[PDB]
Amino acid sequence: SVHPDLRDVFSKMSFFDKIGFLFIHAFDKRNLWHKVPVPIGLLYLNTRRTLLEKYNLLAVGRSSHGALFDPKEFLYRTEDGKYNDPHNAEAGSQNTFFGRNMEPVDQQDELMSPDPFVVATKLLARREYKDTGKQFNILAAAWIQFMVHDWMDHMEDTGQIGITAPKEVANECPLKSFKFHPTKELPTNSDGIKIGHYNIRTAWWDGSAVYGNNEERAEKLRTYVDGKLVIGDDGLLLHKENGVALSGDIRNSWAGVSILQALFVKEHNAVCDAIKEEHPNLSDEELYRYAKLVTSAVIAKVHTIDWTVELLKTKTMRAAMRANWYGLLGKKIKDTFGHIGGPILGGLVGLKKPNNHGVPYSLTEEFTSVFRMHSLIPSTLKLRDPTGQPDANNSPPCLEDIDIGEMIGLKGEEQLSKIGFEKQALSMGYQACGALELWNYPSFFRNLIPQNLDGTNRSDRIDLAALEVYRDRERSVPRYNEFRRRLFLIPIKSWEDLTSDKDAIETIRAIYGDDVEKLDLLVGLMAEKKIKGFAISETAFNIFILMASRRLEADRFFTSNFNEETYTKKGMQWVKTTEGLRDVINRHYPEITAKWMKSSSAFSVWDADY
């Protein structure tokens, strides 16, 4: 039968949705979807995706009456993300509402319940350091922040509020209190959801972390010759006199992200060289437009079939992510004959029309919440010598341990300037990142300098762990158990359902009591027992089934305009022949690649034996 908490929604479903639900629920009740052979696993995922697309896409703000335009007149990715969706010129652009995956839950009377500092101190603060083994390295951790920089940032109110640590835990808090800005609340003037928040980044997967979020930023980064972007002679980003990096989105960053931005600047410039060689007479503007299309597609491809495949290290997930990109008919057929069939057989990429499933494209409040993965950052970075004698392990030899707190923000840019690209990248490649588990949140995040929009330092330092828990509540995102119910997942009845870590359970009970409905989303996501091979929780993964597919399927430039006319022949060939981050690093840094990158993926610890 059907879980009691899901009986109501089940009874209201259409016959076809009832069938899909009973199929997935049969596996879920026995925790079986990830324990079956690949074909049944894929059917499960596709079925779950179809249900999420129907029940978990909610508009924020009025949907009708988008600004009028012809897509044939906009065959490029605009500086602010406008003019993608023919029916909604503003969809995916800078300064638009975050959508929702679920109806908001008002928590305005419980923003401090339980206390954010108590949560941060007792449940999140790093104790014994936990890492991912060989599965996922520090480049993988930098990569995902690099994507967040592409995707999402919430507009802030101009006023300030503050939180003070209670006496029970103050002695263990690096900060005793801190100030920050509330999330800006805007009226939707719509019949549905009444209050929304604005995304100040472009929600389209458009390489905006490299290119900028609007025309005013984008102009600052260009050489205006041959379509190219500015880069230093050391292969690192240039800096303004105030110490801020010249790149697309540089706010609240660190050295690991800066090297990826520099790498993709070189990628963009190399694409410019290649296209100009085939088409000698293109202007700077035309070359920039084509190269941005190519580089943003390379980024989406590397993320989809390389980064995600190492994050979710199972057979079913490698097949699923490759199917989203290439289709179930596979790369050879896709590359030779183009897109065949629908989203399953031919993939999301190269669909003849974009598909938003009836709801204007946006990234969502919940997508923000499940991407809060600050525990991926290790406490220290082991620097290695790119030209050292291979050690006892045949690794490059160790040079010194550096506190990763010294590699963050403006001071991090200074330290990176003394270390250089090769040493930073090699060192990050050879070290595991942190695991997404409880008690694994870096101490330097507990007394962090946050930045203004323009990248400059704020004087009010923050306890990020405490602030994150506060933000989810402030933004009306359902807490862990309700969040699961809204995704058609079986809720916990007791703490034992969540994890078998006895120490975790005892600490959770001391803070939340026996009220499973009180458990914060972030705490639940970190605590949840993980599927073998999964670096993330199943709960987070469910938001991603829907939203990662949506980033590709809703975008004209991954679908109707993913072709030679739009990208150029050479541009399309560049995307088609690039399979992962290894290919990009090999292009610009073949020496450290040949000497030290032994793993097939550049996201594995580089001496992994696969």
Ligand code: HEM
């Ligand atoms: C050392 C590196 C990092 C620093 C210094 C940093 C810092 C910050 C800061 C200061 C905020 C804003 C807090 C607020 O005002 O609400 C933030 C938000 C956020 N961060 Fe990080 N972070 C880092 C790494 C990462 C990583 C690895 C991820 C993984 C995806 C990540 C994901 C996010 C997300 C999803 C948000 C919320 C954005 C929003 O509210 O729209 N960050 N981070």
Ligand SMILES: CCCCCCCCO[C@@H]1O[C@H](CO)[C@@H](O)[C@H](O)[C@H]1O
């Ligand atoms: C073991 C083989 C059982 C047959 C599986 C049918 C269950 C899936 O159900 C179907 O899923 C489709 C997407 O996968 C949806 O389009 C349909 O609405 C849903 O009914």
Ligand SMILES: CCCCCCCCO[C@@H]1O[C@H](CO)[C@@H](O)[C@H](O)[C@H]1O
């Ligand atoms: C019964 C075994 C074969 C079932 C496989 C067919 C399921 C495909 O199902 C289709 O998937 C699409 C794309 O993902 C969904 O958008 C559609 O709603 C559904 O028609």
Ligand SMILES: CCCCCCCCCCCCCCCC(=O)O
């Ligand atoms: C003998 C069992 C083997 C498993 C069978 C797998 C074949 C199913 C794949 C075809 C899916 C149908 C595609 C629908 C349209 C589309 O989205 O492309």
Ligand SMILES: CCCCCCCCCCCCCCCC(=O)O
């Ligand atoms: C062949 C049909 C099955 C297709 C199922 C699609 C499953 C997509 C899973 C997406 C997981 C992405 C997790 C990484 C985070 C992200 O990119 O948003």
Ligand SMILES: [Ca+2]
């Ligand atoms: Ca973007």
Ligand SMILES: [Cl-]
């Ligand atoms: Cl393939």
Ligand SMILES: [Cl-]
């Ligand atoms: Cl491709």
